[PDB]
Design an enzyme around this catalytic site. Structure first.
Site, short mmCIF file in Angstrom:
data_model
loop_
_atom_site.label_atom_id
_atom_site.label_comp_id
_atom_site.label_asym_id
_atom_site.label_seq_id
_atom_site.Cartn_x
_atom_site.Cartn_y
_atom_site.Cartn_z
N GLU A 38 -13.29 3.75 5.32
CA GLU A 38 -12.25 3.15 6.15
C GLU A 38 -12.81 2.23 7.22
OE1 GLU A 38 -8.58 6.39 5.76
OE2 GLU A 38 -10.11 6.65 7.30
N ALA A 82 -7.39 -0.94 -5.46
CA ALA A 82 -8.66 -1.43 -4.94
C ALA A 82 -9.64 -0.30 -4.67
CB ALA A 82 -8.44 -2.23 -3.66
N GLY A 123 -4.03 -1.76 1.11
CA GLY A 123 -3.23 -1.97 2.33
C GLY A 123 -4.01 -2.70 3.41
N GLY A 179 -8.22 -0.14 0.68
CA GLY A 179 -8.60 -1.55 0.44
C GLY A 179 -7.40 -2.38 0.01
N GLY A 194 0.80 -1.21 0.00
CA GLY A 194 0.00 0.00 0.00
C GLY A 194 0.84 1.26 0.00
N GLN A 195 0.18 2.37 -0.30
CA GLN A 195 0.87 3.65 -0.36
C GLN A 195 1.45 4.03 1.00
OE1 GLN A 195 -1.81 6.88 -1.27
NE2 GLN A 195 -0.11 8.35 -1.21
N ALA A 196 0.65 3.89 2.06
CA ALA A 196 1.15 4.19 3.39
C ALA A 196 2.33 3.30 3.75
CB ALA A 196 0.04 4.03 4.42
N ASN A 225 5.30 11.01 8.05
CA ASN A 225 6.02 9.84 7.58
C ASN A 225 7.39 9.74 8.24
OD1 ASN A 225 6.67 7.60 6.12
ND2 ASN A 225 6.58 8.58 4.11
N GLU A 256 10.57 -13.45 21.39
CA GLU A 256 10.71 -12.82 22.69
C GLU A 256 9.74 -11.65 22.82
OE1 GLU A 256 14.66 -11.57 23.50
OE2 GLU A 256 14.21 -10.89 25.53
N1 GTP Z 1 1.97 7.17 3.85
C1 GTP Z 1 0.91 7.57 4.57
N2 GTP Z 1 -0.29 7.07 4.33
C2 GTP Z 1 -1.24 7.59 5.15
C3 GTP Z 1 -1.08 8.53 6.13
N3 GTP Z 1 -2.29 8.81 6.75
C4 GTP Z 1 -3.15 8.03 6.15
N4 GTP Z 1 -2.58 7.28 5.15
C5 GTP Z 1 -3.28 6.27 4.36
O1 GTP Z 1 -2.67 6.06 3.12
C6 GTP Z 1 -3.57 5.16 2.43
C7 GTP Z 1 -3.29 5.14 0.95
O2 GTP Z 1 -2.81 3.82 0.58
P1 GTP Z 1 -3.86 2.62 0.46
O3 GTP Z 1 -4.68 2.55 1.71
O4 GTP Z 1 -3.17 1.39 0.00
O5 GTP Z 1 -4.79 3.13 -0.73
P2 GTP Z 1 -5.59 2.28 -1.82
O6 GTP Z 1 -6.65 3.13 -2.41
O7 GTP Z 1 -5.95 0.97 -1.21
O8 GTP Z 1 -4.44 2.05 -2.90
P3 GTP Z 1 -3.25 3.03 -3.33
O9 GTP Z 1 -3.82 4.42 -3.25
O10 GTP Z 1 -2.84 2.64 -4.73
O11 GTP Z 1 -2.16 2.80 -2.33
C8 GTP Z 1 -4.98 5.60 2.87
O12 GTP Z 1 -5.71 4.47 3.31
C9 GTP Z 1 -4.73 6.58 4.02
O13 GTP Z 1 -5.56 6.32 5.13
C10 GTP Z 1 0.21 9.07 6.38
O14 GTP Z 1 0.54 9.90 7.24
N5 GTP Z 1 1.17 8.51 5.54
#
Ligand code: GTP
Ligand code: YGY
Ligand code: GDP
Lengths: 430, 436
Positions: free
Chosen positions: B183, B99, B146, B144, B10-12, B228, B254
């Site tokens: 979410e 997703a 992550g 969806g 996932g992006q996060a 981050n 542990e």
């Molecule tokens: N990196 C990062 N992500 C965050 C932060 N706060 C919230 N996010 C989450 O970053 C997520 C984005 O990645 P995913 O959850 O995988 O999004 P996705 O729509 O399933 O797929 P992608 O956008 O292609 O990653 C969102 O669900 C946000 O809730 C933050 O501080 N840093």
């Protein structure tokens, strides 16, 4: 008598028994090099009980040391009298024995039971006749409780005839880093009651209590308490080691002592409490020994016998001593404490006398009783177990390791029934 | 002598991993061209930094981690970011379509057609390992990808490796940076199918990280480079135990043993104290007693929950630099003032401490500056039920009138899944509430 095979389990067992070997080896006056130093035959009248001749007719202790944490071998070969042992039974594990049952009980260890039976049979080949066994261990951790029970059952299978004796150390909250102990203790004593002939409750709770409240040591270490237990268990062994009038033996000790068919837990005691000294000592004499033999703060179980009853009694006195005087005070003690003792077996309080003084003290003795006070210790352990058990705790470790809940339930059923048996025999009448 | 594998979904997850791997470079002195002068450049290692870098005969110190994204928007950025030459020729995972906030799309439709490649990559990486302890996965409860793909990954891993443990790092998404509204369904639908294949999971709340950065960092606009970086610092601090060298908490096993009593209760809460503001040169000095005094303040924990209402299980600690255990014992004596402390009757207590003799590393040109002492209390409180209750309120509200339900049903999920997961989370929160 016949020969005795000694078995040593885990870190606690190895340390406690190595110190015990040192204590008696000094008592029997044998050099680290196997050189002979004793100055009389009365020292070597029963040296064959434990020690076996070498190629140079050099007497060698016969014992086995078991564990899986491979760092213990160097601890063995780094003690003062550590290198005394044969370089054939330093067999140990190689990947640690984390204090989880069914790892040393079921998972592994069961693969090396072949090795341990091989070594014990190998050195009982040189034994003309077998008397019994000496398993030293503790009730916490795999190497220790689990291996001890597994070994007990295995040799009971292979040698159903001879005697089976062991020393039990019960870990306590007062000095214990880990907390998975009560499960180990109960899981152990369940095998132990039904699979051994007699056992000594070398406790830690009472040990720590007395060492801190009278001996007042800042940091009870594996040094001090090792010394205490090695000394006391040497005192217990003396009666066999010595020639005595109460010329007791392991089978004889069982017959004389064992009251019921599941109550074989003793309470080794010692009258002249002793710390790490340098000089000869501050003097102690007969009536002091009489009083301190059966005090309330000198045994190895946190119980007051005046709240219970003795099934039997035993003692082994030491040093040059007046036998008639001893018999007089013992007759008084059995006279002035009529209610203290059971009415089921008159002529139970047996007495013996020994000659060689302890290597450091002048007039001492060794108390090996069999009380109805041991129910306090067992009730303590079982209550702490069930407190840890009412809600699960780390029990996933056990279940994923091989047991089930039913084994835990039946272990508690067995322990509480045992406590009921001790209670019952503690409240008899005439 | 005990390998370790991590993985980013996932992006996060990928952004956190980006923020963490360069911190990991900095800590050991590893540099995109570094060589760590005490090595043979051919597997020169087997120290506590070997668990991640499987360094090659080129003296490269390549890592053990892969990144997952259903549509390349961040994984590309790490592929063309700063430490480009730090990764293999297309070891990473790139997809073609996300997703899109739909747990179901990653759990049944899309991931169920990409997962086998991910497992093949994980297995191929693990083969080069010798003594793997387990996996450390980075995900979030928000989207969806992550979340659905993470739960599916959990199932696949537990199928192929049940013996090994696998620690988790998660995010409890906040309304503040809420990039969706679906979410909570993803969160419940991920926590329900996580337990049976989870062992120990850490949640770091973007509500908490956002609050910390806005308050005590003098930043009003927390991009995905500020929060981050802060989270990367926390993660490095927590995993330093296994990372740098040997002390308390060597192994994931542990972790479990000294943290988790009850397999339904395995979400440890992490606290921190040194929140160095900025390039501010001079404020005052610092004391170890001060930071350990601060590590009890509810405002300074990685997840918002006030623990003066509940009991702790096992409050471990870590430290950097300036050993002084007597001061630590004094700290325990002071915090014994029983104003906001508790423990549980059944099992005794242990404040195990492990010291690292290296001062904490800092981001060179970031929103921080180098300090000399650090500490992180992983108190397995019973107060962590606040987050679950808060999320349960919202899930119940949305499921009152069956909102958005079609977007899950029409993709390979049934209607009963929502109800059963709600009941299961009810049982879980009951299991926390009863301990006491
Ligand atoms: N990196 C990062 N992500 C965050 C932060 N706060 C919230 N996010 C989450 O970053 C997520 C984005 O990645 P995913 O959850 O995988 O999004 P996705 O729509 O399933 O797929 P992608 O956008 O292609 O990653 C969102 O669900 C946000 O809730 C933050 O501080 N840093
Ligand atoms: C409620 O949460 C709590 C958490 C911790 C504490 C105190 C905490 N707890 C325990 O682990 C105690 C017993 C659990 C057993 C469990 C039940 C046995 O199966 C273990 C096992 C061993 C090896 C491999 C697989 C499984 O684990 C251990 O003994 C391990 C030894 C090993 C891992 C080196 O660790 C330790 O010995 C420690 C961590 C040094 C001892 N110390 C502690 O301060 C109290 C509470 Cl209340
Ligand atoms: N080493 C040692 N341990 C003791 C002694 N007395 C009590 N113990 C306790 O026995 C337990 C040690 O169990 P151990 O045999 O090490 O288990 P293992 O890890 O499976 O070998 C600990 O709870 C100690 O507190 C002693 O004199 N020496």
């Amino acid at each position: 008598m016949r020969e005795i095979v000694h078995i040593q389990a885990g870190q606690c067992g190895n340390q406690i028994g190595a110190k015990f070997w040192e204590v008696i080896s000094d008592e029997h006056g044998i050099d680290p090099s196997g050189n002979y130093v004793g100055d009389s035959d009365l020292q070597l009248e029963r040296i064959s009980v434990y020690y076996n001749e070498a190629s140079s007719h050099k007497y060698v202790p016969r014992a086995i040391l078991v564990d899986l944490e491979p760092g213990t071998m160097d601890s063995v070969r780094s003690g003062a009298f550590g290198h005394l042992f044969r370089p054939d039974n330093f067999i140990f594990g190689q990947s640690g024995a984390g204090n989880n049952w069914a790892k040393g009980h079921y998972t592994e260890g069961a693969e090396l039971v072949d090795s341990v039976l091989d070594v014990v049979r190998k050195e009982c080949e040189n034994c003309d006749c077998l008397q019994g066994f000496q398993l030293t261990h503790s009730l916490g951790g795999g190497t220790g409780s689990g291996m001890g029970t597994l070994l007990i059952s295995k040799v009971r299978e292979e040698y159903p005839d001879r005697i089976m004796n062991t020393f039990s150390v019960v870990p306590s909250p007062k000095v214990s880093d880990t907390v998975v102990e009560p499960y180990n203790a109960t899981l152990s004593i369940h095998q132990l009651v039904e699979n051994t002939d007699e056992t000594y409750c070398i406790d830690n709770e009472a040990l720590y209590d007395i060492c801190f409240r009278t001996l007042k040591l800042a940091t009870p270490t594996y040094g001090d308490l090792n010394h205490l237990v090695s000394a006391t268990m040497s005192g217990v062994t003396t009666s066999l080691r010595f020639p005595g009038q109460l010329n007791a033996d392991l089978r004889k000790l069982a017959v004389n002592m064992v009251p019921f068919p599941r109550l074989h837990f003793f309470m080794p005691g010692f009258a002249p409490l002793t710390a790490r000294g340098s000089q000869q000592y501050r003097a102690l004499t007969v009536p002091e020994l009489t009083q301190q033999m059966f005090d309330a703060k000198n045994m190895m179980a946190a119980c007051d016998p005046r709240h219970g009853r003795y099934l039997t009694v035993a003692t082994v006195f030491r040093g040059r001593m007046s036998m008639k005087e001893v018999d007089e005070q013992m007759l008084a003690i059995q006279s002035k404490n009529s209610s203290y003792f059971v009415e089921w077996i008159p002529n139970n309080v047996k007495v013996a006398v020994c000659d060689i003084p302890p290597r450091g003290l002048k007039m001492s003795s060794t108390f090996i009783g069999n009380s109805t006070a041991i129910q306090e210790l067992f009730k303590r352990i079982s209550e702490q177990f069930t407190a840890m058990f009412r809600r699960k705790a780390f029990l996933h470790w056990y279940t994923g390791e091989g047991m089930d809940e039913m084994e835990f339930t039946e272990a508690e059923s067995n322990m509480n029934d045992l406590v009921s048996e001790y209670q019952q025999y503690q409240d008899a009448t005439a | 002598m005990r390998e370790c594998i991590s993985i980013h979904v996932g992006q996060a997850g990928v952004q956190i991993g980006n923020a963490c791997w360069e911190l990991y470079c900095l800590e050991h002195g590893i540099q995109p061209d570094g060589q760590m002068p005490s090595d043979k450049t051919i597997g020169g290692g087997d120290d506590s930094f070997n668990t991640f870098f499987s360094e090659t005969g080129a003296g490269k110190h390549v890592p053990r981690a892969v990144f997952v994204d259903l549509e390349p928007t961040v994984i590309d950025e790490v592929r063309t970011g700063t430490y480009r030459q730090l990764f293999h020729p297309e070891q990473l995972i790139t997809g073609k379509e996300d997703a899109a906030n739909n747990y179901a799309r990653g759990h049944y439709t899309i991931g169920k057609e990409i997962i086998d490649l991910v497992l093949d990559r994980i297995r191929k990486l693990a083969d080069q390992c010798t003594g793997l302890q387990g996996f450390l996965v980075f995900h979030s409860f928000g989207g969806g990808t992550g979340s659905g793909f993470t739960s599916l990954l959990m199932e696949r891993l537990s199928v192929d490796y049940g013996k090994k443990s696998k620690l988790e790092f998660s995010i409890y998404p906040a309304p503040q940076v809420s990039t969706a509204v679906v979410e909570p369904y993803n969160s419940i639908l991920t926590t329900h199918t996580t337990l049976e294949h989870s062992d120990c999971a850490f949640m770091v709340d973007n509500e908490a990280i956002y609050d910390i950065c806005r308050r005590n960092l003098d930043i009003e606009r927390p991009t995905y480079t500020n929060l981050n970086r802060l989270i990367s610092q926390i993660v490095s601090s927590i995993t330093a135990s296994l990372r740098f060298d040997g002390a308390l908490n060597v192994d994931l096993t542990e972790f479990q043993t000294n943290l988790v009593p009850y397999p339904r209760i395995h979400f440890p809460l992490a606290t921190y104290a040194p929140v160095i503001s900025a390039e501010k040169a001079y404020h005052e000095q610092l004391s170890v007693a001060e930071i350990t005094n601060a590590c009890f303040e509810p405002a300074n924990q990685m997840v918002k929950c006030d623990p003066r209402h509940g009991k702790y299980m096992a409050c471990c600690l870590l430290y950097r630099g300036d050993v002084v255990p007597k001061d630590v014992n004094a700290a325990i004596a002071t915090i014994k003032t029983k104003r906001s402390i508790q423990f549980v009757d059944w099992c005794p207590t242990g404040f195990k401490v492990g010291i690292n003799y290296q001062p904490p590393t800092v981001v060179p040109g970031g929103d921080l500056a180098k300090v000399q002492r650090a500490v992180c209390m992983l108190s397995n409180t019973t107060a962590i039920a606040e987050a679950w209750a808060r999320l349960d309120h919202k899930f119940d509200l949305m499921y009152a009138k069956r909102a958005f339900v079609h977007w899950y049903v029409g993709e390979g999920m049934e209607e009963g899944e929502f109800s059963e997961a709600r009941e299961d989370m009810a049982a879980l929160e009951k299991d926390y509430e009863e301990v006491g």
